[PDB]
Amino acid sequence: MLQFEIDDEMEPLYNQAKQMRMKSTFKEDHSLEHRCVESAKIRAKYPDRVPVIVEKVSGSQIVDIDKRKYLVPSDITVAQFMWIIRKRIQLPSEKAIFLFVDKTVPQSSLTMGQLYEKEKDEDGFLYVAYSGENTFGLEV
Amino acid sequence: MLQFEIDDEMEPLYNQAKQMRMKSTFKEDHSLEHRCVESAKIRAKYPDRVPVIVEKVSGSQIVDIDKRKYLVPSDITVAQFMWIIRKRIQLPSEKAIFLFVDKTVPQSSLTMGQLYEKEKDEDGFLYVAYSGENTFGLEV
Structure with missing residues:
Protein backbone atom coordinates (compact mmCIF):
# COMPACT_ATOMS: atom_id res chain seq x y z
CA MET A 1 0.00 0.00 0.00
CA LEU A 2 1.10 3.57 0.72
CA ILE A 85 12.32 -43.99 18.65
CA ARG A 86 14.67 -43.76 21.64
CA LYS A 87 16.79 -46.52 20.07
CA ARG A 88 16.72 -44.81 16.67
CA ILE A 89 18.05 -41.51 18.08
CA GLN A 90 20.30 -43.27 20.66
CA LEU A 91 18.95 -41.25 23.57
CA PRO A 92 20.35 -42.66 26.85
CA SER A 93 17.72 -44.15 29.16
CA GLU A 94 18.53 -41.61 31.89
CA LYS A 95 17.16 -38.82 29.65
CA ALA A 96 13.39 -38.48 29.32
CA ILE A 97 11.58 -38.69 25.98
CA PHE A 98 8.01 -37.62 25.18
CA LEU A 99 5.71 -38.48 22.31
CA PHE A 100 2.91 -36.13 21.29
CA VAL A 101 -0.21 -36.71 19.21
CA ASP A 102 -2.40 -33.64 18.67
CA LYS A 103 -0.18 -31.76 21.15
CA THR A 104 -0.89 -34.22 23.99
CA VAL A 105 0.97 -37.24 25.40
CA PRO A 106 -0.80 -40.47 24.34
CA GLN A 107 -1.40 -43.03 27.08
CA SER A 108 1.49 -45.47 26.94
CA SER A 109 -0.56 -48.70 26.88
CA LEU A 110 -2.59 -47.75 23.78
CA THR A 111 -1.70 -49.62 20.62
CA MET A 112 -0.61 -47.77 17.53
CA GLY A 113 -3.64 -49.29 15.79
CA GLN A 114 -6.02 -47.73 18.32
CA LEU A 115 -4.27 -44.40 18.12
CA TYR A 116 -4.29 -44.57 14.33
CA GLU A 117 -7.99 -45.26 13.99
CA LYS A 118 -8.88 -42.43 16.36
CA GLU A 119 -6.21 -39.78 15.67
CA LYS A 120 -5.05 -40.27 12.08
CA ASP A 121 -4.74 -37.11 10.00
CA GLU A 122 -7.19 -36.30 7.21
CA ASP A 123 -4.38 -37.48 4.91
CA GLY A 124 -4.35 -41.00 6.41
CA PHE A 125 -1.04 -40.79 8.31
CA LEU A 126 -0.62 -40.69 12.08
CA TYR A 127 1.63 -37.77 13.03
CA VAL A 128 3.79 -38.31 16.13
CA ALA A 129 6.09 -35.64 17.50
CA TYR A 130 8.85 -36.28 19.99
CA SER A 131 11.02 -34.23 22.29
CA GLY A 132 13.15 -34.46 25.38
CA GLU A 133 13.28 -32.18 28.38
CA ASN A 134 14.02 -28.46 27.88
CA THR A 135 17.01 -27.05 29.76
CA PHE A 136 16.34 -23.50 28.45
CA GLY A 137 20.09 -23.27 27.98
CA LEU A 138 20.56 -23.36 31.76
CA GLU A 139 23.19 -25.16 33.86
CA VAL A 140 21.88 -28.67 34.53
CA MET B 1 -21.23 -6.03 5.87
CA LEU B 2 -23.63 -7.02 3.09
CA ILE B 85 1.16 -30.73 42.24
CA ARG B 86 0.59 -34.49 42.09
CA LYS B 87 -0.15 -34.45 45.83
CA ARG B 88 -2.46 -31.45 45.46
CA ILE B 89 -4.59 -33.16 42.78
CA GLN B 90 -4.19 -36.64 44.39
CA LEU B 91 -3.05 -38.27 41.16
CA PRO B 92 -1.91 -41.86 41.89
CA SER B 93 1.79 -42.49 41.28
CA GLU B 94 1.00 -45.09 38.60
CA LYS B 95 -0.43 -42.32 36.38
CA ALA B 96 2.00 -40.01 34.59
CA ILE B 97 2.00 -36.24 35.08
CA PHE B 98 3.70 -33.61 32.91
CA LEU B 99 4.62 -30.00 33.58
CA PHE B 100 4.98 -27.52 30.73
CA VAL B 101 6.68 -24.13 30.57
CA ASP B 102 6.42 -22.34 27.21
CA LYS B 103 4.84 -25.52 25.77
CA THR B 104 7.89 -27.67 26.63
CA VAL B 105 8.74 -30.02 29.51
CA PRO B 106 11.30 -28.36 31.82
CA GLN B 107 14.28 -30.48 32.85
CA SER B 108 13.41 -32.05 36.19
CA SER B 109 16.59 -31.07 38.06
CA LEU B 110 16.25 -27.33 37.39
CA THR B 111 15.25 -25.23 40.38
CA MET B 112 12.15 -23.10 40.28
CA GLY B 113 14.42 -20.10 40.83
CA GLN B 114 16.42 -20.88 37.68
CA LEU B 115 13.27 -21.47 35.68
CA TYR B 116 11.77 -18.26 37.04
CA GLU B 117 14.70 -16.05 36.16
CA LYS B 118 14.85 -17.42 32.62
CA GLU B 119 11.19 -18.12 31.74
CA LYS B 120 9.07 -15.73 33.82
CA ASP B 121 6.27 -13.96 31.94
CA GLU B 122 6.45 -10.26 31.12
CA ASP B 123 4.03 -9.88 34.06
CA GLY B 124 6.53 -11.35 36.56
CA PHE B 125 4.81 -14.70 37.18
CA LEU B 126 6.06 -18.10 36.06
CA TYR B 127 3.26 -19.95 34.25
CA VAL B 128 3.29 -23.75 34.62
CA ALA B 129 0.77 -25.99 32.90
CA TYR B 130 0.16 -29.60 33.82
CA SER B 131 -1.53 -32.58 32.26
CA GLY B 132 -1.65 -36.34 32.37
CA GLU B 133 -1.68 -38.82 29.53
CA ASN B 134 -4.41 -38.58 26.87
CA THR B 135 -6.55 -41.69 26.34
CA PHE B 136 -8.51 -40.04 23.48
CA GLY B 137 -11.57 -41.63 25.05
CA LEU B 138 -10.26 -45.07 24.09
CA GLU B 139 -10.33 -48.34 26.05
CA VAL B 140 -7.21 -48.41 28.24
Whole structure:
Protein backbone atom coordinates (compact mmCIF):
# COMPACT_ATOMS: atom_id res chain seq x y z
CA MET A 1 0.00 0.00 0.00
CA LEU A 2 1.10 3.57 0.72
CA GLN A 3 2.86 2.88 4.03
CA PHE A 4 5.39 0.18 4.92
CA GLU A 5 6.99 -1.46 7.93
CA ILE A 6 9.40 -4.19 9.08
CA ASP A 7 6.79 -6.97 8.84
CA ASP A 8 6.99 -8.90 12.12
CA GLU A 9 5.31 -11.84 10.37
CA MET A 10 8.18 -12.10 7.88
CA GLU A 11 11.11 -11.50 10.24
CA PRO A 12 11.18 -15.08 11.61
CA LEU A 13 11.12 -16.34 8.01
CA TYR A 14 14.11 -14.16 7.09
CA ASN A 15 16.01 -15.31 10.20
CA GLN A 16 15.25 -18.97 9.49
CA ALA A 17 16.18 -18.61 5.82
CA LYS A 18 19.65 -17.24 6.65
CA GLN A 19 20.42 -20.60 8.32
CA MET A 20 20.52 -22.65 5.12
CA ARG A 21 23.42 -24.64 3.68
CA MET A 22 16.24 -27.59 4.69
CA LYS A 23 14.43 -29.59 7.40
CA SER A 24 11.02 -29.41 5.74
CA THR A 25 8.26 -31.59 7.16
CA PHE A 26 6.44 -34.47 5.48
CA LYS A 27 3.41 -32.23 4.88
CA GLU A 28 5.60 -29.43 3.52
CA ASP A 29 7.22 -31.86 1.07
CA HIS A 30 4.11 -33.56 -0.36
CA SER A 31 0.71 -32.32 -1.50
CA LEU A 32 -2.38 -33.38 0.41
CA GLU A 33 -3.60 -35.40 -2.60
CA HIS A 34 -0.29 -37.28 -2.80
CA ARG A 35 -0.31 -38.07 0.93
CA CYS A 36 -3.91 -39.36 0.72
CA VAL A 37 -3.08 -41.58 -2.26
CA GLU A 38 0.03 -42.93 -0.50
CA SER A 39 -1.64 -43.75 2.82
CA ALA A 40 -4.51 -45.47 1.02
CA LYS A 41 -1.96 -47.60 -0.87
CA ILE A 42 -0.15 -48.48 2.37
CA ARG A 43 -3.39 -49.49 4.09
CA ALA A 44 -4.45 -51.63 1.12
CA LYS A 45 -1.08 -53.40 0.84
CA TYR A 46 -0.31 -53.81 4.58
CA PRO A 47 -3.60 -54.13 6.49
CA ASP A 48 -1.90 -54.58 9.89
CA ARG A 49 0.55 -51.67 9.54
CA VAL A 50 -0.14 -48.06 10.51
CA PRO A 51 1.73 -45.36 8.53
CA VAL A 52 3.36 -42.98 11.02
CA ILE A 53 5.35 -39.78 10.48
CA VAL A 54 7.79 -39.00 13.32
CA GLU A 55 9.14 -35.46 13.63
CA LYS A 56 11.00 -33.63 16.37
CA VAL A 57 9.05 -30.87 18.10
CA SER A 58 10.16 -27.68 16.38
CA GLY A 59 12.90 -25.96 18.35
CA SER A 60 13.57 -28.86 20.72
CA GLN A 61 17.20 -29.35 21.72
CA ILE A 62 17.02 -33.14 21.29
CA VAL A 63 18.83 -34.75 18.37
CA ASP A 64 16.94 -35.08 15.09
CA ILE A 65 15.90 -38.50 13.80
CA ASP A 66 17.34 -39.97 10.59
CA LYS A 67 14.10 -41.58 9.40
CA ARG A 68 10.63 -40.06 9.55
CA LYS A 69 8.26 -42.51 7.80
CA TYR A 70 7.43 -45.77 9.62
CA LEU A 71 5.09 -48.65 8.77
CA VAL A 72 4.38 -49.79 12.33
CA PRO A 73 2.73 -53.08 13.35
CA SER A 74 -0.66 -52.13 14.72
CA ASP A 75 -0.23 -54.11 17.97
CA ILE A 76 2.90 -52.15 18.95
CA THR A 77 2.07 -50.06 22.03
CA VAL A 78 2.84 -46.38 22.50
CA ALA A 79 5.47 -47.30 25.11
CA GLN A 80 7.07 -49.79 22.70
CA PHE A 81 7.13 -47.27 19.87
CA MET A 82 8.67 -44.71 22.22
CA TRP A 83 11.40 -47.27 22.95
CA ILE A 84 11.90 -47.74 19.19
CA ILE A 85 12.32 -43.99 18.65
CA ARG A 86 14.67 -43.76 21.64
CA LYS A 87 16.79 -46.52 20.07
CA ARG A 88 16.72 -44.81 16.67
CA ILE A 89 18.05 -41.51 18.08
CA GLN A 90 20.30 -43.27 20.66
CA LEU A 91 18.95 -41.25 23.57
CA PRO A 92 20.35 -42.66 26.85
CA SER A 93 17.72 -44.15 29.16
CA GLU A 94 18.53 -41.61 31.89
CA LYS A 95 17.16 -38.82 29.65
CA ALA A 96 13.39 -38.48 29.32
CA ILE A 97 11.58 -38.69 25.98
CA PHE A 98 8.01 -37.62 25.18
CA LEU A 99 5.71 -38.48 22.31
CA PHE A 100 2.91 -36.13 21.29
CA VAL A 101 -0.21 -36.71 19.21
CA ASP A 102 -2.40 -33.64 18.67
CA LYS A 103 -0.18 -31.76 21.15
CA THR A 104 -0.89 -34.22 23.99
CA VAL A 105 0.97 -37.24 25.40
CA PRO A 106 -0.80 -40.47 24.34
CA GLN A 107 -1.40 -43.03 27.08
CA SER A 108 1.49 -45.47 26.94
CA SER A 109 -0.56 -48.70 26.88
CA LEU A 110 -2.59 -47.75 23.78
CA THR A 111 -1.70 -49.62 20.62
CA MET A 112 -0.61 -47.77 17.53
CA GLY A 113 -3.64 -49.29 15.79
CA GLN A 114 -6.02 -47.73 18.32
CA LEU A 115 -4.27 -44.40 18.12
CA TYR A 116 -4.29 -44.57 14.33
CA GLU A 117 -7.99 -45.26 13.99
CA LYS A 118 -8.88 -42.43 16.36
CA GLU A 119 -6.21 -39.78 15.67
CA LYS A 120 -5.05 -40.27 12.08
CA ASP A 121 -4.74 -37.11 10.00
CA GLU A 122 -7.19 -36.30 7.21
CA ASP A 123 -4.38 -37.48 4.91
CA GLY A 124 -4.35 -41.00 6.41
CA PHE A 125 -1.04 -40.79 8.31
CA LEU A 126 -0.62 -40.69 12.08
CA TYR A 127 1.63 -37.77 13.03
CA VAL A 128 3.79 -38.31 16.13
CA ALA A 129 6.09 -35.64 17.50
CA TYR A 130 8.85 -36.28 19.99
CA SER A 131 11.02 -34.23 22.29
CA GLY A 132 13.15 -34.46 25.38
CA GLU A 133 13.28 -32.18 28.38
CA ASN A 134 14.02 -28.46 27.88
CA THR A 135 17.01 -27.05 29.76
CA PHE A 136 16.34 -23.50 28.45
CA GLY A 137 20.09 -23.27 27.98
CA LEU A 138 20.56 -23.36 31.76
CA GLU A 139 23.19 -25.16 33.86
CA VAL A 140 21.88 -28.67 34.53
CA MET B 1 -21.23 -6.03 5.87
CA LEU B 2 -23.63 -7.02 3.09
CA GLN B 3 -23.14 -10.80 3.35
CA PHE B 4 -23.16 -13.04 6.42
CA GLU B 5 -22.17 -16.53 7.52
CA ILE B 6 -21.99 -18.94 10.48
CA ASP B 7 -18.70 -17.49 11.79
CA ASP B 8 -16.42 -20.47 12.44
CA GLU B 9 -14.38 -18.26 14.78
CA MET B 10 -17.39 -17.70 17.02
CA GLU B 11 -18.85 -21.22 17.01
CA PRO B 12 -16.41 -22.61 19.62
CA LEU B 13 -17.23 -19.60 21.81
CA TYR B 14 -20.98 -20.30 21.55
CA ASN B 15 -20.42 -24.00 22.32
CA GLN B 16 -18.22 -23.20 25.32
CA ALA B 17 -20.65 -20.58 26.60
CA LYS B 18 -23.57 -23.05 26.66
CA GLN B 19 -21.62 -25.05 29.29
CA MET B 20 -21.97 -22.51 32.09
CA ARG B 21 -23.65 -22.95 35.48
CA MET B 22 -16.39 -20.14 34.58
CA LYS B 23 -12.85 -21.57 34.62
CA SER B 24 -11.17 -18.35 33.55
CA THR B 25 -7.38 -18.19 33.75
CA PHE B 26 -5.23 -15.96 35.95
CA LYS B 27 -4.47 -13.71 32.96
CA GLU B 28 -8.14 -13.59 31.97
CA ASP B 29 -9.07 -12.50 35.50
CA HIS B 30 -6.50 -9.74 36.07
CA SER B 31 -5.17 -6.89 33.95
CA LEU B 32 -1.53 -6.92 32.91
CA GLU B 33 -0.85 -3.84 35.07
CA HIS B 34 -2.35 -5.54 38.13
CA ARG B 35 -0.32 -8.72 37.58
CA CYS B 36 2.90 -6.69 37.20
CA VAL B 37 2.21 -4.74 40.40
CA GLU B 38 1.40 -7.95 42.30
CA SER B 39 4.48 -9.92 41.20
CA ALA B 40 6.73 -6.96 42.01
CA LYS B 41 5.19 -6.84 45.51
CA ILE B 42 5.72 -10.58 45.98
CA ARG B 43 9.36 -10.36 44.89
CA ALA B 44 10.00 -7.41 47.21
CA LYS B 45 8.37 -9.06 50.23
CA TYR B 46 9.62 -12.65 49.70
CA PRO B 47 13.01 -12.53 47.94
CA ASP B 48 13.46 -16.33 47.95
CA ARG B 49 9.97 -17.18 46.65
CA VAL B 50 8.97 -17.44 43.00
CA PRO B 51 5.31 -16.62 42.15
CA VAL B 52 3.92 -19.46 40.03
CA ILE B 53 0.52 -19.89 38.36
CA VAL B 54 -0.46 -23.55 37.82
CA GLU B 55 -3.20 -24.33 35.31
CA LYS B 56 -4.37 -27.54 33.67
CA VAL B 57 -3.67 -27.82 29.94
CA SER B 58 -6.92 -26.78 28.28
CA GLY B 59 -9.00 -29.81 27.36
CA SER B 60 -6.93 -32.32 29.32
CA GLN B 61 -8.89 -35.12 30.97
CA ILE B 62 -6.93 -34.88 34.23
CA VAL B 63 -8.64 -33.46 37.30
CA ASP B 64 -8.48 -29.70 37.83
CA ILE B 65 -6.45 -28.25 40.71
CA ASP B 66 -8.08 -26.38 43.60
CA LYS B 67 -5.37 -23.74 43.96
CA ARG B 68 -3.58 -21.93 41.14
CA LYS B 69 -1.29 -19.33 42.77
CA TYR B 70 1.83 -20.59 44.58
CA LEU B 71 4.71 -18.79 46.29
CA VAL B 72 7.36 -21.47 45.79
CA PRO B 73 10.75 -21.64 47.54
CA SER B 74 13.31 -20.94 44.85
CA ASP B 75 15.44 -24.02 45.65
CA ILE B 76 12.52 -26.41 45.01
CA THR B 77 13.33 -28.46 41.90
CA VAL B 78 11.01 -29.06 38.96
CA ALA B 79 10.69 -32.72 40.03
CA GLN B 80 9.82 -31.67 43.59
CA PHE B 81 7.22 -29.17 42.40
CA MET B 82 5.74 -31.84 40.14
CA TRP B 83 5.42 -34.05 43.22
CA ILE B 84 3.70 -31.17 45.06
CA ILE B 85 1.16 -30.73 42.24
CA ARG B 86 0.59 -34.49 42.09
CA LYS B 87 -0.15 -34.45 45.83
CA ARG B 88 -2.46 -31.45 45.46
CA ILE B 89 -4.59 -33.16 42.78
CA GLN B 90 -4.19 -36.64 44.39
CA LEU B 91 -3.05 -38.27 41.16
CA PRO B 92 -1.91 -41.86 41.89
CA SER B 93 1.79 -42.49 41.28
CA GLU B 94 1.00 -45.09 38.60
CA LYS B 95 -0.43 -42.32 36.38
CA ALA B 96 2.00 -40.01 34.59
CA ILE B 97 2.00 -36.24 35.08
CA PHE B 98 3.70 -33.61 32.91
CA LEU B 99 4.62 -30.00 33.58
CA PHE B 100 4.98 -27.52 30.73
CA VAL B 101 6.68 -24.13 30.57
CA ASP B 102 6.42 -22.34 27.21
CA LYS B 103 4.84 -25.52 25.77
CA THR B 104 7.89 -27.67 26.63
CA VAL B 105 8.74 -30.02 29.51
CA PRO B 106 11.30 -28.36 31.82
CA GLN B 107 14.28 -30.48 32.85
CA SER B 108 13.41 -32.05 36.19
CA SER B 109 16.59 -31.07 38.06
CA LEU B 110 16.25 -27.33 37.39
CA THR B 111 15.25 -25.23 40.38
CA MET B 112 12.15 -23.10 40.28
CA GLY B 113 14.42 -20.10 40.83
CA GLN B 114 16.42 -20.88 37.68
CA LEU B 115 13.27 -21.47 35.68
CA TYR B 116 11.77 -18.26 37.04
CA GLU B 117 14.70 -16.05 36.16
CA LYS B 118 14.85 -17.42 32.62
CA GLU B 119 11.19 -18.12 31.74
CA LYS B 120 9.07 -15.73 33.82
CA ASP B 121 6.27 -13.96 31.94
CA GLU B 122 6.45 -10.26 31.12
CA ASP B 123 4.03 -9.88 34.06
CA GLY B 124 6.53 -11.35 36.56
CA PHE B 125 4.81 -14.70 37.18
CA LEU B 126 6.06 -18.10 36.06
CA TYR B 127 3.26 -19.95 34.25
CA VAL B 128 3.29 -23.75 34.62
CA ALA B 129 0.77 -25.99 32.90
CA TYR B 130 0.16 -29.60 33.82
CA SER B 131 -1.53 -32.58 32.26
CA GLY B 132 -1.65 -36.34 32.37
CA GLU B 133 -1.68 -38.82 29.53
CA ASN B 134 -4.41 -38.58 26.87
CA THR B 135 -6.55 -41.69 26.34
CA PHE B 136 -8.51 -40.04 23.48
CA GLY B 137 -11.57 -41.63 25.05
CA LEU B 138 -10.26 -45.07 24.09
CA GLU B 139 -10.33 -48.34 26.05
CA VAL B 140 -7.21 -48.41 28.24
